[PDB]
């Protein structure tokens, strides 16, 4: 499991089955693909039914989030881990 250990504590944006994307620091994982996100922010695209406009993103801070692997679809590297050096 070196490919999953290489992305440890990084800002990963995991895409859910419902289309939402949660970006956060992946703190822990398991064999059932359950992820632990630190300071997670959830965003989702809303289809504009009123007129032809841009897609609306609705973000929300959850903090320590425990996501099930059954609801997880895909996850990519979005940002670096929070570095302590200046």
């Amino acid at each position: 499991s070196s490919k999953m250990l290489q992305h440890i504590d990084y800002r990963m944006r995991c895409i859910l089955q419902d289309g939402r994307i949660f970006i956060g620091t992946f703190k822990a994982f398991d064999k059932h693909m359950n992820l632990i996100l630190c300071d997670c922010d959830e965003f989702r695209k809303i289809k504009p039914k009123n007129s032809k406009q841009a897609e609306r993103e609705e973000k929300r801070v959850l903090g320590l989030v425990l996501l099930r692997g059954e609801n997880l679809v895909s996850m990519t590297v979005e940002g670096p881990p929070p570095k302590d050096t200046g």
Binding site: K3, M33, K45, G69, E70, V73, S74, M75, T76, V77
Partner: protein
């Protein structure tokens, strides 16, 4: 088992089409027994969404619906073990 044949597909450029219509084309760097595929430099085209390039992309085995291999893949040699 058939997961052993997919586990030998490391560094091969495949196209994983998901059940939600998302199609990710890229070189799979790793595969597991639970059909999870980790790929590098992938291009993802979701349903009603624009494609995007990523340096790394992990897909679970439950969300993967189909996998398109290259035509020059040795399917006869890879099925021996």
């Amino acid at each position: 088992k058939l997961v052993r044949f997919l586990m030998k597909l490391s560094h091969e450029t495949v196209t994983i089409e998901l059940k939600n219509g998302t199609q990710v084309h890229g070189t799979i760097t790793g595969v597991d027994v639970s059909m999870n595929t980790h790929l590098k430099a992938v291009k993802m085209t979701l349903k009603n969404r624009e494609p995007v390039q990523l340096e790394t992309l992990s897909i679970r085995g439950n969300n993967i619906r189909y996998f398109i291999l290259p035509d020059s893949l040795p399917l006869d040699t890879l099925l021996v073990d």
